């Protein structure tokens, strides 16, 4: 039951075994131990209880020094119930941090040591040091840099002046100061005035019961809080927190012989014995084939097949680029006389992380080949890391041969740039071409006029890199010479060069260099794509990893979402290692945030266990019984402590304080998502814990709508959208924000009947408020009509459309996008009669209003077109995520067509109009 028998190992070699409760804190267990130890031999020899610390083997299989004795044995969760006393003394900082990391990332650091891979070890040393340094450096600076680091300003994208009554306050003081000020007032104006208002450049304003601070050179109206307060009517309640209170928070070449590879053996193969096994091999540079694909002989199907066969390639060693990858696929072929069975695949870098060409034997633990649309012999886009299941997985034994008495490395930049140095008819023939897939005759024209491309077409660098023959080192040196003198490209062009088709490390270096102009705000908008692109990297230490880490240590919000982006994929074998090494480095440099993410991951662990119970208890007792059988399981000391007082993983500046267990429920949906409510100690907020469904798809959809909202908001168009948070936290687990005062159009319609929504809106907006809500409906309708049409999100019914008490419409449960319904087809613009009605304020005909709504739809679509390449570039990088709905060229193509990307602005607007008008015509029929 509650109690558990614990083994205790005393430093005298004495052994005690007695029962204790699973909820007992370690401090309490130590006392029961000293009480029983006095009646066991060699007690006199022991030092005081406080002289010792408990040691245990945690879930992640490593020894853990259990320093915080306020932890319950249940929260410690040791492998077997074994505790060992050890002398406290040593570096009880690295011992403490290393342990917390292993728990937090859900992988023991020992797994990294076990590998005996220097690449892993060098990454760890360099990255942990860079981070540790940046953290130490962070600690040096004063309150202004720190408040900028931990609580970065949450501002509106960006106008009149208005009267604003603002309720000021002070630290500890329960005495308010309702002082009114100008909409365009700087922070000091709202500050020192209230300091002068109390008496008759120190401190900053803080939003009550939030980690949101008002500071810096900006007008009040430009701050999300003030801004939302103005719109929702409500008066902003600030607090003056002194500098003292903030500080308290603060504390050579030659080899002209061919490329040779010795396919020695295969291992643990699981194929039909009737068949024959073949190993197909190719050489690649990104997506491009570096030469013809050599194949092995057929050998009979067995577990350990032997080939001991030499494979030569139509590429001479000195021609192999830095990023050359050897790709393998094992096939089960029906011996020569209807489909060739793809067994497994494996990719390998021809050069190591230190520029040295790999020699000797290699045992490549292989990944299963997934049967798909692109049959493809090989998988060059696949990961270069070995299948971590070295245990039960198939493998291939290869041997790259020695080719010199001394090891050979790829040339240095100086020896590359050395070799690299050095008409009006064709000048037109370059303009016509540079105005995606260039034809081989056009390719050579671009390469010949490559200096003309650098001089007059710098934005066509991507086009130039793809025409380059990466299988001829002469051609590579030439390109690289121009690269090292190329003008800095805009963020938009740089985003394109992050994709798998640009594997050269010099390319990646240029791409990051141009991405260094990004404000924390715009960076946050691409963060998900940038994390995804790490899956296309060849080596652990790369420019993108370093960039992503620099940014995360410079901004806390970025660091937080970078943590969850990597954390939520710690289950995927392909990324576990890479992501794990980034998370350790991030943690080492963000020890403060480590404490927050620890609290969050803990509550998350409880919710998975709580949800798991409810899921089961649904297939037993009825819903109100389960509800009450959930409230007792929640009110357990440990459950309630873990679920209380934490920063929200969805928005770390939101303080989820006291759980309202009475208000906590679950949803009658498939995966039974938990409805968890909280109340404000100083400032309501709720979270939805869903486990079972993949949330990546929904987060990308929501991120894009938010991007659209920012792009629209930037050009003075506020379409009153609801960018509710959705965050994947783990394996088929995530959180979804609670939008209070909202209901699904199906539920609203069942409580005239054509006026069912208008009555609901009337019952939530009386008199003067009715006209406000319809403008909220009109504005949100347009935005979501345009959004869902552009993204190809179909199946838009009343169970997946929601209305807010303010009048704002918004979409939920985006199951599929890009025309997919399983089967991708062009989703038309959809005008719903029910909505068209509310827009017309109840009338049959009201073009006065309806045409204004037409304008919102039309300008929303027009703005999206202006940023069409952004969405294509972003979506093209998302192909690294491996979502079925976003796996190829035709998925990204959807966007080109939806946004009429090809067609002129006028040609696009007239087709949008035709589609709009027919959505209104077909609206009537439904
Ligand atoms: C108080 C209470 O116990 N309620 C009332 C809310 N409710 C309900 C109904 C219809 C839609 C949504 C719903 C779905 C989503 C939603 C948005 C995106 N995905 N989802 C569903 C998901 F959370 F499961 F993912 C959201 C949301 N973000 N905020 C508020 N309600 N809400 C909730 C309920 O079933 C119960 C559980 C009966």
Q: Are 777 and 801 in contact (CB under 8 A)?
A: no
Q: For residue 113, how many other CB atoms are within 10 A of its CB?
A: 13
**If you measure from the C-alpha of residue 622 to the centroid of ligand 1, how many angstroms do you get, rounded to a whole number?**
19
736 lines ligand 1 (CB under 6 A): yes
Burial string for 239-271 (b: 16+ CB within 10 Å, else e) reads: bbbebebbeeebeeeebeeebebebbebbebeb
Q: Give the span between the Cα atoms of 819 and 884, in whole angstroms.
A: 12
Q: Give the span between the Cα atoms of 73 and 69, in whole angstroms.
A: 10
**For residue 262, which phi and psi values (nearest 5 degrees)?**
-100, 100
Would you give the DSSP letter of residue 375?
-
Residue nearest to atom 3 of ligand 1 (CA): 665
What are the beta bridge partners of residue 676?
687
What are the beta bridge partners of residue 17?
7
CA 357 to chain centre: 34
687 lines ligand 1 (CB under 6 A): no
Scanning 715-790, the segments in alpha helix (DSSP H) are 745-748, 756-764, 769-790
Q: Give the span between the Cα atoms of 74 and 63, in whole angstroms.
A: 17
805 lines ligand 1 (CB under 6 A): no
Which ligand 1 atom minimizes the distance to the CA of 669? 24
Question: Which residues have a Cβ under 8 Å from the Cβ of 87 and sit 6 or more positions away?
Answer: 11, 51, 52, 53
Q: What is the DSSP string of 105-168?
A: HTS-HHHHHHT--HHHHHHHHHHHHHHHHHHHHHHHS-HHHHHHHHS---B-------EEEEEE
Pocket mutation for ligand 1, best pick of 702, 802, 808, 814 (most atoms within 8 Å of C-beta): 802
Q: Give the span between the Cα atoms of 134 and 149, in whole angstroms.
A: 12
601 lines ligand 1 (CB under 6 A): no
**If you measure from the C-alpha of residue 667 to the centroid of ligand 1, how many angstroms do you get, rounded to a whole number?**
7
Question: Which residues have a Cβ under 8 Å from the Cβ of 179 and sit 6 or more positions away?
Answer: 165, 166, 168, 190, 193, 194, 197
Q: Are 649 and 599 in contact (CB under 8 A)?
A: no
Scanning 623-755, the segments in alpha helix (DSSP H) are 623-634, 637-642, 696-714, 745-748
Question: Which residues have a Cβ under 8 Å from the Cβ of 692 and sit 6 or more positions away?
Answer: 670, 671, 732
Q: Under the phi-then-psi rule, with left for phi > 0, alpha for psi from -120 to 50, and beta for the rest, what region is 316?
A: beta
Q: For residue 693, how many other CB atoms are within 10 A of its CB?
A: 17
Q: Which two tokens stand for residue 337?
A: 């006389």
Q: After which residues is the chain broken (C to N over 2.5 A)?
A: 158, 200, 251, 337, 422, 435, 683, 751, 821
Q: Give the span between the Cα atoms of 477 and 483, in whole angstroms.
A: 10
- Specify the residue for token string 């077409």: 457
Q: Which two tokens stand for residue 247?
A: 């500080």
Return the H-helix or E-strand segment holding 743: strand 742-744
Which ligand 1 atom minimizes the distance to the CA of 665? 3
**If you measure from the C-alpha of residue 879 to the centroid of ligand 1, how many angstroms do you get, rounded to a whole number?**
30
Q: For residue 225, how many other CB atoms are within 10 A of its CB?
A: 21
Q: Which two tokens stand for residue 141?
A: 């600076």
Pocket mutation for ligand 1, best pick of 674, 685, 688, 798 (most atoms within 8 Å of C-beta): 688
Strands of the sheet with 360-365, listed across from one edge: 306-316, 258-267, 395-400, 360-365
Q: For residue 296, how many other CB atoms are within 10 A of its CB?
A: 19
Question: Which residues have a Cβ under 8 Å from the Cβ of 831 and sit 6 or more positions away?
Answer: 785, 916, 919, 920, 922, 923
Q: Give the span between the Cα atoms of 240 and 213, in whole angstroms.
A: 10
Q: Is 649 exposed, middle or buried (0-12, 13-18, 19+ CB in 10 A)?
A: buried
Q: Are 887 and 746 in contact (CB under 8 A)?
A: no
Residue nearest to atom 2 of ligand 1 (CA): 665
264 lines ligand 1 (CB under 6 A): no
Which ligand 1 atom minimizes the distance to the CA of 666? 37
**If you measure from the C-alpha of residue 430 to the centroid of ligand 1, how many angstroms do you get, rounded to a whole number?**
56
Would you give the DSSP letter of residue 371?
P
Return the H-helix or E-strand segment holding 343: strand 341-349
Q: Give the span between the Cα atoms of 715 and 708, in whole angstroms.
A: 11
798 lines ligand 1 (CB under 6 A): no
User: How far apart, in Å, are the Cα atoms of 570 and each of 288, 573, 577, 886?
Assistant: 30, 8, 8, 21
Q: Give the span between the Cα atoms of 77 and 59, in whole angstroms.
A: 7
Strands of the sheet with 809-811, listed across from one edge: 742-744, 801-804, 809-811
Question: Which residues have a Cβ under 8 Å from the Cβ of 427 and sit 6 or more positions away?
Answer: 449, 452
**If you measure from the C-alpha of residue 602 to the centroid of ligand 1, how many angstroms do you get, rounded to a whole number?**
24
Pocket mutation for ligand 1, best pick of 611, 615, 667, 702 (most atoms within 8 Å of C-beta): 667
Which ligand 1 atom minimizes the distance to the CA of 740? 30
660 lines ligand 1 (CB under 6 A): no
**If you measure from the C-alpha of residue 572 to the centroid of ligand 1, how many angstroms do you get, rounded to a whole number?**
29
- The experimental method is X-ray
Scanning 357-423, the segments in alpha helix (DSSP H) are 413-420
Q: Give the span between the Cα atoms of 265 and 361, in whole angstroms.
A: 11
Q: Give the span between the Cα atoms of 746 and 762, in whole angstroms.
A: 17
Which ligand 1 atom minimizes the distance to the CA of 690? 24
Q: Give the span between the Cα atoms of 706 and 683, in whole angstroms.
A: 26
**If you measure from the C-alpha of residue 875 to the centroid of ligand 1, how many angstroms do you get, rounded to a whole number?**
28
CA angle 99, 102, 108 (to 5 degrees): 110
Q: At what angle do helices 94-105 and 576-589 cross, to 10 degrees?
A: 140
Q: Under the phi-then-psi rule, with left for phi > 0, alpha for psi from -120 to 50, and beta for the rest, what region is 41?
A: beta
Q: Are 34 and 16 in contact (CB under 8 A)?
A: no
Q: Are 9 and 40 in contact (CB under 8 A)?
A: no
Q: Are 20 and 6 in contact (CB under 8 A)?
A: yes
Give the resolution to one decimal, in Å. 2.8
Q: Give the span between the Cα atoms of 458 and 471, in whole angstroms.
A: 24
464 lines ligand 1 (CB under 6 A): no
- CA-nearest of 879, 897, 912 to 826 is 897
Residue nearest to atom 15 of ligand 1 (CA): 812
Would you give the DSSP letter of residue 78?
B
**If you measure from the C-alpha of residue 624 to the centroid of ligand 1, how many angstroms do you get, rounded to a whole number?**
17
Burial string for 184-217 (b: 16+ CB within 10 Å, else e) reads: ebebeebbeebeeeeeeeebbbbbbbbbbbbbee
User: How far apart, in Å, are the Cα atoms of 358 and each of 348, 349, 363, 365, 800?
Assistant: 10, 8, 13, 17, 54
Residue nearest to atom 25 of ligand 1 (CA): 736
C-alpha Rg value of the chain to the nearest Å: 31
Q: Are 152 and 556 in contact (CB under 8 A)?
A: yes
Q: For residue 231, how many other CB atoms are within 10 A of its CB?
A: 13
Q: Are 560 and 593 in contact (CB under 8 A)?
A: yes
Q: Is 629 exposed, middle or buried (0-12, 13-18, 19+ CB in 10 A)?
A: middle
Q: Which two tokens stand for residue 436?
A: 């995606």
- Specify the residue for token string 């540790």: 132
Contacts made by residues 367-375, CB under 8 angstroms, sequence distance 24+: 367/393, 367/574, 368/343, 368/344, 369/329, 369/342, 369/343, 369/344, 369/345, 371/342, 373/888, 374/888
677 lines ligand 1 (CB under 6 A): no
**If you measure from the C-alpha of residue 672 to the centroid of ligand 1, how many angstroms do you get, rounded to a whole number?**
11
744 lines ligand 1 (CB under 6 A): yes
812 lines ligand 1 (CB under 6 A): yes
Q: At what angle do helices 556-567 and 520-533 cross, to 10 degrees?
A: 20
Q: What is the DSSP string of 804-850?
A: ETTS-EEE------TT-------PPP---HHHHHHHTTT-S--HHHH
Q: Which two tokens stand for residue 870?
A: 């952004």
**If you measure from the C-alpha of residue 736 to the centroid of ligand 1, how many angstroms do you get, rounded to a whole number?**
9
800 lines ligand 1 (CB under 6 A): no
Q: Give the span between the Cα atoms of 852 and 487, in whole angstroms.
A: 44
738 lines ligand 1 (CB under 6 A): yes
**If you measure from the C-alpha of residue 489 to the centroid of ligand 1, how many angstroms do you get, rounded to a whole number?**
44
690 lines ligand 1 (CB under 6 A): yes
Specify the 3-state DSSP secondary structure of 691: strand
Return the H-helix or E-strand segment holding 728: strand 726-730
Burial string for 49-58 (b: 16+ CB within 10 Å, else e) reads: eeebbbbbeb
Which ligand 1 atom minimizes the distance to the CA of 737? 28
- CA-nearest of 270, 331, 334 to 302 is 270
**If you measure from the C-alpha of residue 803 to the centroid of ligand 1, how many angstroms do you get, rounded to a whole number?**
12
Return the H-helix or E-strand segment holding 923: helix 905-925
**If you measure from the C-alpha of residue 642 to the centroid of ligand 1, how many angstroms do you get, rounded to a whole number?**
23
Residue nearest to atom 36 of ligand 1 (CA): 667
673 lines ligand 1 (CB under 6 A): yes
**For residue 400, which phi and psi values (nearest 5 degrees)?**
-85, 135
**If you measure from the C-alpha of residue 558 to the centroid of ligand 1, how many angstroms do you get, rounded to a whole number?**
28
**In 826-920, which ranges are E strands?**
none
688 lines ligand 1 (CB under 6 A): yes
**If you measure from the C-alpha of residue 615 to the centroid of ligand 1, how many angstroms do you get, rounded to a whole number?**
17
675 lines ligand 1 (CB under 6 A): yes
**For residue 661, which phi and psi values (nearest 5 degrees)?**
-55, -30
**For residue 348, which phi and psi values (nearest 5 degrees)?**
-145, 135
Q: Give the span between the Cα atoms of 742 and 725, in whole angstroms.
A: 15
What is the SS3 assignment for 348-370? EECECCCCEECCEEEEEECEECC
Q: Are 738 and 651 in contact (CB under 8 A)?
A: no
Which ligand 1 atom minimizes the distance to the CA of 675? 37
Residue nearest to atom 35 of ligand 1 (CA): 667
Helix %, strand %, coil % of the chain (to 5): 45, 20, 40
**If you measure from the C-alpha of residue 705 to the centroid of ligand 1, how many angstroms do you get, rounded to a whole number?**
19
Q: Which two tokens stand for residue 458?
A: 């710098």
**If you measure from the C-alpha of residue 802 to the centroid of ligand 1, how many angstroms do you get, rounded to a whole number?**
10
Q: Which two tokens stand for residue 271?
A: 């194929």
Q: What is the DSSP string of 483-534?
A: HTTPPPPPHHHHHHTTSTT---HHHHHHHHHHHTT--HHHHHHHHHHHHHHG
Q: Give the span between the Cα atoms of 920 and 910, in whole angstroms.
A: 15
Contacts made by residues 704-708, CB under 8 angstroms, sequence distance 24+: 704/787, 704/791, 704/871, 704/874, 705/784, 705/787, 705/791, 705/811, 706/525, 707/525, 707/870, 707/871, 707/874, 708/783, 708/786, 708/787, 708/790, 708/860, 708/864
183 lines ligand 1 (CB under 6 A): no
Scanning 170-242, the segments in alpha helix (DSSP H) are 187-199, 224-232
What is the SS3 assignment for 277-321? EEEEEEEEECCEECCCCCECCCEECCCCCEEEEEEEEEEEHHHCC
């Amino acid at each position: 039951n509650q109690s558990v028998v614990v083994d205790f190992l005393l430093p005298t070699g004495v052994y005690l075994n007695f029962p204790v409760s699973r909820n007992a804190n370690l401090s309490t267990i130590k006392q029961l131990l000293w009480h029983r130890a006095q009646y066991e031999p060699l007690f006199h020899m022991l030092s005081g209880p406080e002289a010792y610390v408990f040691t245990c083997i945690n879930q992640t299989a490593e020894q853990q020094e259990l320093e915080d004795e306020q932890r319950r044995l249940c929260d410690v969760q040791p492998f077997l119930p074994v505790l060992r006393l050890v002398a406290r003394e040593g570096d009880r900082v690295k011992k403490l941090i290393n342990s917390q990391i292993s728990l937090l990332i859900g992988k023991g650091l020992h797994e990294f040591d076990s590998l005996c891979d220097p690449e892993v070890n060098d990454f760890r040393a360099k990255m942990c040091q860079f981070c540790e340094e940046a953290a130490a450096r962070r600690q040096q600076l004063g309150w202004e840099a720190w408040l900028q680091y931990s609580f970065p300003l949450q501002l509106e994208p960006s106008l009149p002046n208005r009267a604003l009554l603002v309720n000021v306050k002070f630290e500890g003081s329960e005495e308010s100061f309702t002082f009114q000020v100008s909409t365009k007032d700087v922070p000091l104006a709202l500050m020192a005035c209230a300091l002068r208002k109390k008496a008759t450049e120190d401190y900053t304003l803080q939003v009550n019961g939030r980690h949101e601070y008002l500071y810096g050179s900006y007008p009040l109206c430009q701050f999300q809080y003030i801004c939302s307060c103005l719109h929702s009517g409500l008066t902003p309640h600030l607090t003056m927190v002194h500098s003292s209170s903030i500080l308290a928070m603060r504390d050579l070449w030659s080899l002209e012989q061919p490329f040779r590879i010795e396919l020695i053996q295969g291992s643990k193969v699981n194929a039909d014995e009737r068949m024959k096994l073949v190993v197909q091999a190719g050489l690649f540079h990104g997506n491009e084939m570096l030469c013809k694909t050599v194949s092995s002989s057929e050998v009979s199907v067995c577990s350990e097949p032997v080939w001991k066969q030499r494979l030569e390639f139509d590429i001479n060693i000195c021609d192999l680029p830095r990023m050359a990858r050897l790709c393998f696929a094992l096939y089960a072929v029906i011996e020569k006389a209807k489909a060739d069975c793809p067994i497994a695949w494996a990719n390998l870098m021809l050069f190591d992380y230190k520029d040295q060409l790999k020699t000797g034997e290699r045992c490549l633990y292989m990944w299963p080949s997934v049967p798909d649309e692109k049959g493809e012999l090989l998988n060059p886009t696949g990961t270069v890391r070995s299948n971590p299941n070295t245990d039960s997985a198939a493998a291939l034994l290869i041997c790259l041969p020695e080719v010199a008495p001394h090891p050979v490395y790829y040339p240095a930049l100086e020896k590359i740039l050395e070799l690299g140095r050095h008409t009006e008819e064709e000048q037109l023939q370059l303009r016509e071409i540079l105005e995606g897939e260039l034809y081989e005759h056009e390719k050579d024209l671009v390469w010949k006029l490559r200096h003309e491309v650098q001089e007059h077409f710098p934005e066509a660098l991507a086009r130039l890199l793809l025409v380059t023959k990466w299988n001829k080192h002469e051609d590579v040196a030439q390109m690289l010479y121009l690269l090292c003198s190329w003008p800095e490209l805009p963020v938009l062009s740089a985003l394109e060069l992050l994709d798998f088709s640009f594997p050269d490390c010099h390319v990646g270096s240029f791409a990051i260099k141009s991405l260094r102009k990004l404000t924390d705000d715009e960076l946050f908008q691409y963060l998900l794509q940038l994390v995804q692109v790490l899956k296309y990297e060849s080596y652990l230490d790369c420019e993108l990893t370093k960039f992503l880490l620099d940014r995360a240590l410079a901004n806390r919000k970025i660091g937080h979402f970078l943590f969850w982006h990597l954390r939520s994929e710690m289950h995927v074998p392909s990324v576990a290692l890479r992501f794990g090494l980034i998370l350790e480095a991030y943690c080492r440099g963000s020890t403060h945030h480590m404490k927050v993410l620890m609290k969050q991951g803990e509550a998350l662990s409880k919710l998975k266990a709580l949800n798991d119970f409810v899921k089961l208890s649904s297939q037993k007792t009825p819903k109100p019984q389960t509800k009450e059988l959930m409230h007792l399981c929640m009110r357990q000391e440990a459950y309630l402590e873990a679920l209380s007082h934490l920063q929200s993983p969805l928005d770390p500046s939101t303080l989820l304080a006291e759980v309202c267990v009475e208000q906590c429920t679950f949803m009658d949906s498939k995966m039974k998502p938990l409805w968890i409510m909280y109340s404000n100690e100083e400032a309501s907020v709720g979270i939805i814990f869903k486990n079972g469904d993949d949330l990546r798809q929904d987060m990308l959809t929501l991120q894009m709508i938010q991007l659209m909202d920012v792009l629209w908001k930037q050009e003075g168009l506020d379409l009153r959208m609801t960018p509710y948070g959705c965050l994947p936290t783990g394996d088929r687990t995530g959180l979804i924000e609670v939008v209070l005062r909202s209901d699904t159009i199906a539920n609203i319609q069942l409580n005239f009947n054509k006026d069912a929504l208008l009555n609901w809106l009337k019952s939530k907006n009386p008199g003067e408020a009715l006209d406000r809500a319809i403008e909220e409906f009109t504005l949100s309708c347009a935005g979501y009509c345009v959004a869902t049409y552009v993204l190809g999100i179909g199946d838009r019914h009343s169970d997946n459309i929601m209305i807010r008490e303010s009048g704002q419409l918004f979409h939920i449960d985006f199951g599929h996008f890009l025309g997919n319904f399983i089967n991708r087809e062009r989703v038309p613009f959809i005008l719903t009669y029910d909505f068209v009605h509310v827009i017309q304020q109840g009338k049959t005909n009201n073009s006065e209003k309806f045409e204004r709504f037409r304008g919102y739809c039309e300008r929303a679509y027009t703005i999206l077109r202006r940023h069409g390449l952004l969405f294509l570039h972003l979506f093209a990088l998302m192909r690294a995520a491996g979502l079925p709905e976003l796996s190829c060229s035709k998925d990204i193509q959807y966007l080109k067509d939806s946004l009429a990307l090809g067609k002129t602005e006028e040609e696009a607007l007239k087709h949008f109009r035709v589609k709009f008008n027919e959505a209104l015509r077909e609206s009537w029929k439904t």
